[PDB]
Design an enzyme around this catalytic site. Structure first.
Site, PDB file in Angstrom:
ATOM      1  N   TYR A  26       0.983  -1.095   0.224  1.00 61.68           N
ATOM      2  CA  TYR A  26      -0.066  -0.095  -0.179  1.00 61.68           C
ATOM      3  C   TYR A  26       1.262   1.188  -0.036  1.00 61.68           C
ATOM      4  O   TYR A  26       2.133   1.127   0.301  1.00 61.68           O
ATOM      5  CB  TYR A  26      -0.739  -0.069   1.047  1.00 61.68           C
ATOM      6  CG  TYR A  26       0.333  -0.534   2.637  1.00 61.68           C
ATOM      7  CD1 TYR A  26       0.707  -1.557   2.599  1.00 61.68           C
ATOM      8  CD2 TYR A  26       0.438   1.178   3.207  1.00 61.68           C
ATOM      9  CE1 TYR A  26       0.959  -0.868   4.020  1.00 61.68           C
ATOM     10  CE2 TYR A  26       0.663   0.852   4.652  1.00 61.68           C
ATOM     11  CZ  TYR A  26       1.753   0.113   5.148  1.00 61.68           C
ATOM     12  OH  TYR A  26       2.580   0.704   6.299  1.00 61.68           O
ATOM     13  N   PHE A  36       2.647   8.492   4.320  1.00 56.68           N
ATOM     14  CA  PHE A  36       3.337   8.854   5.980  1.00 56.68           C
ATOM     15  C   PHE A  36       3.594   7.505   6.126  1.00 56.68           C
ATOM     16  O   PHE A  36       4.327   7.009   6.899  1.00 56.68           O
ATOM     17  CB  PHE A  36       2.181   9.399   6.537  1.00 56.68           C
ATOM     18  CG  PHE A  36       1.204   9.029   6.842  1.00 56.68           C
ATOM     19  CD1 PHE A  36       0.336   8.901   5.610  1.00 56.68           C
ATOM     20  CD2 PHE A  36       0.164   7.639   7.629  1.00 56.68           C
ATOM     21  CE1 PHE A  36      -0.773   8.473   5.182  1.00 56.68           C
ATOM     22  CE2 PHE A  36      -0.664   7.312   7.821  1.00 56.68           C
ATOM     23  CZ  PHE A  36      -1.162   7.544   6.339  1.00 56.68           C
ATOM     24  N   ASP A  37       2.352   6.658   5.410  1.00 57.67           N
ATOM     25  CA  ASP A  37       2.652   4.925   5.412  1.00 57.67           C
ATOM     26  C   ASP A  37       2.549   4.443   4.595  1.00 57.67           C
ATOM     27  O   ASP A  37       1.597   4.468   3.615  1.00 57.67           O
ATOM     28  CB  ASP A  37       1.086   4.557   5.998  1.00 57.67           C
ATOM     29  CG  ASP A  37       1.116   3.752   7.565  1.00 57.67           C
ATOM     30  OD1 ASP A  37       1.606   3.090   7.433  1.00 57.67           O
ATOM     31  OD2 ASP A  37       0.572   4.973   8.560  1.00 57.67           O
ATOM     32  N   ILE A  56      -4.941  -0.267  11.765  1.00 61.37           N
ATOM     33  CA  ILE A  56      -6.238   0.827  12.075  1.00 61.37           C
ATOM     34  C   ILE A  56      -7.475  -0.063  11.897  1.00 61.37           C
ATOM     35  O   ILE A  56      -7.252  -0.441  10.733  1.00 61.37           O
ATOM     36  CB  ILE A  56      -6.038   2.140  11.437  1.00 61.37           C
ATOM     37  CG1 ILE A  56      -5.469   2.067  10.120  1.00 61.37           C
ATOM     38  CG2 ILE A  56      -4.960   2.905  12.016  1.00 61.37           C
ATOM     39  CD1 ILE A  56      -5.972   3.575   9.972  1.00 61.37           C
ATOM     40  N   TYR A  82      -6.726   7.534  13.233  1.00 61.64           N
ATOM     41  CA  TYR A  82      -5.730   7.287  15.241  1.00 61.64           C
ATOM     42  C   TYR A  82      -6.717   8.933  15.162  1.00 61.64           C
ATOM     43  O   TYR A  82      -5.908   9.553  15.555  1.00 61.64           O
ATOM     44  CB  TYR A  82      -3.986   7.628  14.232  1.00 61.64           C
ATOM     45  CG  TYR A  82      -3.667   7.105  13.594  1.00 61.64           C
ATOM     46  CD1 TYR A  82      -2.843   6.075  13.648  1.00 61.64           C
ATOM     47  CD2 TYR A  82      -3.265   7.124  12.019  1.00 61.64           C
ATOM     48  CE1 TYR A  82      -2.151   4.384  13.367  1.00 61.64           C
ATOM     49  CE2 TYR A  82      -2.251   6.211  11.250  1.00 61.64           C
ATOM     50  CZ  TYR A  82      -1.728   5.037  12.168  1.00 61.64           C
ATOM     51  OH  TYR A  82      -1.698   4.381  10.835  1.00 61.64           O
ATOM     52  N   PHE A  99      -4.923   5.306   1.098  1.00 64.49           N
ATOM     53  CA  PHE A  99      -3.933   3.951   1.619  1.00 64.49           C
ATOM     54  C   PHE A  99      -4.556   3.179   0.591  1.00 64.49           C
ATOM     55  O   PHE A  99      -5.636   2.846   0.138  1.00 64.49           O
ATOM     56  CB  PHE A  99      -4.855   2.634   2.368  1.00 64.49           C
ATOM     57  CG  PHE A  99      -3.614   3.693   4.028  1.00 64.49           C
ATOM     58  CD1 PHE A  99      -4.224   4.127   5.255  1.00 64.49           C
ATOM     59  CD2 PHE A  99      -2.842   2.601   3.824  1.00 64.49           C
ATOM     60  CE1 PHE A  99      -3.633   4.443   5.588  1.00 64.49           C
ATOM     61  CE2 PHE A  99      -2.173   2.514   5.309  1.00 64.49           C
ATOM     62  CZ  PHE A  99      -2.894   4.444   5.837  1.00 64.49           C
TER      63      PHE A  99
END
EC number: 5.2.1.8
Length: 107
Positions: A26, A36-37, A56, A82, A99
């Site tokens: 992803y 960021f991810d 999450i 979050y 995502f």
């Protein structure tokens, strides 16, 4: 919170199961800023289990809601990410996460 905007549907019948691991690739980007991810894991994309909340909600939910070989751009909200207390720099408060996940396979 989370939304599933698939790009490539997957078979349509094979999804993760309670007790399986998911293998996903992803891109976690933010509404209008940056990544960021991201899973640029050299030789092994991210994996997690369903029912163990190792990710999450947006993901446990989102990804559970995707099939083997399906790719989607999921949009997650605080409630499914979050919530409010994020990590100041990666996830500031009330930031929406996006995502682009590809469910590669189950392990």
């Amino acid at each position: 919170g989370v939304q599933v905007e698939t790009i490539s549907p997957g078979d349509g019948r094979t999804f993760p199961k309670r007790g399986q691991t998911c293998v996903v690739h992803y891109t976690g980007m933010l509404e209008d800023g940056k990544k960021f991810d991201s899973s640029r894991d050299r030789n092994k994309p991210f994996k997690f289990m369903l029912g163990k909340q190792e990710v999450i909600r947006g993901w446990e939910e989102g990804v559970a809601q995707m099939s083997v070989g399906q790719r989607a751009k999921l949009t997650i909200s605080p409630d499914y990410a979050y919530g409010a207390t994020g990590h100041p720099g990666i996830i500031p408060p009330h930031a929406t996460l996006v995502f682009d996940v590809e469910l590669l396979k189950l392990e």
